[PDB]
Amino acid sequence: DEDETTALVCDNGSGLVKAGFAGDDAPRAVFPSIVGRPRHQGVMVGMGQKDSYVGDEAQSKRGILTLKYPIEHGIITNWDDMEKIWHHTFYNELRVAPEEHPTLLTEAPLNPKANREKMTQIMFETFNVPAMYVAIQAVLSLYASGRTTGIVLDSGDGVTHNVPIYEGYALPHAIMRLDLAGRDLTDYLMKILTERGYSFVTTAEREIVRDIKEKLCYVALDFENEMATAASSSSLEKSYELPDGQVITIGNERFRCPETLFQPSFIGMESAGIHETTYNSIMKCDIDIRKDLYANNVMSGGTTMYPGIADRMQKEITALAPSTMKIKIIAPPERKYSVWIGGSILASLSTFQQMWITKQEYDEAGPSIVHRKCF
Amino acid sequence: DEDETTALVCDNGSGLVKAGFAGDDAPRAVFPSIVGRPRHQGVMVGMGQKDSYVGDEAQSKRGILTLKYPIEHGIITNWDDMEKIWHHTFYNELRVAPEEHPTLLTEAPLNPKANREKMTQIMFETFNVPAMYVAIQAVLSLYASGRTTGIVLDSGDGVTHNVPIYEGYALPHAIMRLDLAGRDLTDYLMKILTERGYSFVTTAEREIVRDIKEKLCYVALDFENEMATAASSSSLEKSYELPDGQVITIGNERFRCPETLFQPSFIGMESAGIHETTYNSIMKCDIDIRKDLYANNVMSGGTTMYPGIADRMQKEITALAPSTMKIKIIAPPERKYSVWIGGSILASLSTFQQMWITKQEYDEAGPSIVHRKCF
Amino acid sequence: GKRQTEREKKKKILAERRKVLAIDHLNEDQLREKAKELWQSIYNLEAEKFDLQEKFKQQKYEINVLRNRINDNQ
Amino acid sequence: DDIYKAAVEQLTEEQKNEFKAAFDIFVLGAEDGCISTKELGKVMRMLGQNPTPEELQEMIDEVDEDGSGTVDFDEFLVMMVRCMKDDSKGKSEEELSDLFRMFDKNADGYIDLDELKIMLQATGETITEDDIEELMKDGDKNNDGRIDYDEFLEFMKGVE
Amino acid sequence: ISASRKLQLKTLLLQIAKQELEREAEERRGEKGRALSTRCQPLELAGLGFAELQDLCRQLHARVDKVDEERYDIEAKVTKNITEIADLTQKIFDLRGKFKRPTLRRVRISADAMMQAL
Ligand SMILES: Nc1ncnc2c1ncn2[C@@H]1O[C@H](COP(=O)(O)OP(=O)(O)O)[C@@H](O)[C@H]1O
Ligand SMILES: Nc1ncnc2c1ncn2[C@@H]1O[C@H](COP(=O)(O)OP(=O)(O)O)[C@@H](O)[C@H]1O
């Protein structure tokens, strides 16, 4: 722990938890949001026999544990799970006590207000944090980009959000949430791999196939033409070496998996591709600034490490929108940490401690005070 | 008897009984599970004229006694036989009274639950042991190896069991019992020796030929090629000096006897070799840990004193499974005592007396209490 | 839930620990002896507050010890 | 040599007094006063331990380096100090954790090499190479760069 | 024989360690004393008015209240620390057991016997 009473910066992103100290450039403890529990009961002795398993421990013990998600698309299952994982993060991973450091947290866009009130109340009772602040990840990604104008595409693991912000002002009237995310990607890839001869249901193979998505997946420039040329495609077809050692070969599926977000009709969504969701979002607001939105679009999330989103994005928007002004996307490398960086940025300036949510305000007005203290 | 009230440790292995005190490194009284009975009736006087003969006494008196097996492949013939042999072990061989020492026993894998209930009930009524615990020999061999991950091949004299255990957790769904064991080995060798000109039926020659298996037998690296070169094989052919003094010469049979377990089609089993049984066992469980199972296989039993199981094991598994990761077998010398060693290990720690099966629990709930007290 | 328990447990503990003075009736000499006693009590409280702070630092050190013992354990 | 006085310092007075007065169980009269090496095993049975051929033969090798076939009293004390490892009737650990706090002068959780060098030179002996090198081999096992409380306890076991 | 040298090095090491323990304890006591002098300065009642001394008593009451509150907060922090100490320590005991439990017990002791008695 630093000698100074600097604040805690924790991004509880929908899919990854990244925690550390204020003034740091990158979060120190970063772990996926999976939680493992003992698949069977206790009869043995001498070691183990522990209920909750979180972090890399559960990653190593994936096979023996039922792998469960305490949060999915924002919905909260069991607050005890968050209690334990935050205990682990603060003491076993961050080696910090929350008594002496206020916490800045980031929440998924348009999270329930009742969810905020319950989570804040359990937090304040269970923990002894001196002060509090929670913010939407959209403005955090904006801060990471450091440009007040643009539309943020937050692609988490449970929801994809499109949020327009012009000159550092939120536009909730033109903000939308789409239920397509990593979960859907894994599902669709699971069914295609089932049609390829490999049919698995458990979560270990879920992580294997999301790793495959991280490594080999394409974003098709032209879809049906690329499957037409991918009929044989000995060179274009790509293989992976699974940890057991078998060589699993995939061809068109590499660019037929992310395409589903662009083409939701593959597995039955009324909503069109996410580019349509950015398009409608843009026109909902006044006409004039729309061009700037076209030229200032930002994309954020862990998924963004994949190739192909930028070219597809610009080409389709230019197809939909007039091609007079040039559209260009901006995306700094390793932007999944960017939100946490913005949290540090929030703690950088000396005005931030004017609106810390202190203990006594919550003791006076209950959780309801946040309704007036954040917004 | 030690001044301290330390527990009894007894391994009633399927083929050998090894009994002693807790805290000891090796069992004190070790004898084969053969039981001899008078072949004829009584007319003489002045000596002998005793019904049950057990241990080395029966070994010396093999010729005069009908040699019978109170247990074969786990099945129990007559509880009176176990009563007498346990009396002999406790008083004539261990020189101990079971009144003042709780007993830790090991049982053959997947032994009948009705067998457990009857044996425990007759035990508690007949004997006055203060407390009880019975465990599967698989975890005992695991304890002897001292590594929570691996698949145990228990090769007793009645059954061969394959049991996978990952991170000290039993996997009954992937556990199998094969009816090939020492009995089969002796039988097959008996028929081959019959085809060699020597045809015996009695048990003395059974022990002679199992001794031959202990001394001279090979495990063929390549089977048909080694009989092809064993056609003449003056050097490769090996001889034995039978106690009567005749020289009995055996050639390819040395490696054609253990091969039957690997090649059951010789005497008609639908099940393939025991390596196939370890292979299927491995794949039944999740894919990922299978590599660790490949690298952590353990073999246990008195048979393991023979050469050739290790090389054959690894080569065939590498033939069946991909050869990326290196497979290596571990087998400490004199591992047939290892189970008993693990029993001592169980009595080593001070938590073991938390779940002793005391007399009053059995008096309250009958034998049925073990259904809730062990598992 | 536990909202009042924690707060009024803490206030109860600070009530049994601290002593309440009927200051209004206290006589001149009484203000003398008592403000001396109260200042001495605050002195001792700060003394073993500093002791608590130091020993807090060392218990942090032994946390450091044990957590490092844990991380080496893998 | 320094091993004789180190064995003196690492063993309590009552133990060594009983050890010598009990070694005097073999001498009876008109003898040299030093019994043959093998008889030493017998006094060990009196001590309450039950050693084994490997340790017995090794320990036998640990006496009479110059090859006289006989054991003197200083070699007797060093071998005894080298036999039972329960020195100081069980070394403590709590105050020792306080001493662990002592090795560290920056309050980090572990012992730096610079902190060890200043600690060693504070005795009066300077730094030589075999000193710190051997101290590192004794203290560490995997080049972790520090001495934690487990390695702390391990390194000085029995030392007072 | 290098073992002599190493043992006397660590002996002198631990003796100087005990000296440093004594010295650091003295420094802790001195820092406590100076912090006492600076946190609670000498008395102020000489020649004061009784009514103001009423106000002084009430002020010292508030002072003792809040400093007791601060003590409560600090000792609660310590208590959480100690609970984590205990749990982590148990984990340490087990984890050390993994590396050293099957390795210290009897070694051929019983093997030594009368092999001719049978
Ligand atoms: N290094 C990486 N390369 C590619 N994809 C990644 C990487 N790390 C994480 N991801 C993907 O990001 C997803 C998690 O998104 P996350 O960054 O938590 O969203 P948010 O920005 O809302 O927190 C995971 O499902 C995973 O598939
Ligand atoms: N010293 C030895 N060398 C080779 N084989 C042996 C030896 N001792 C026993 N065996 C074999 O082991 C078999 C008994 O197996 P056992 O160890 O009782 O199985 P378990 O491990 O299930 O108790 C006997 O049939 C015998 O052939």
Ligand SMILES: [Mg+2]
């Ligand atoms: Mg995101």
Ligand SMILES: [Mg+2]
């Ligand atoms: Mg066996």
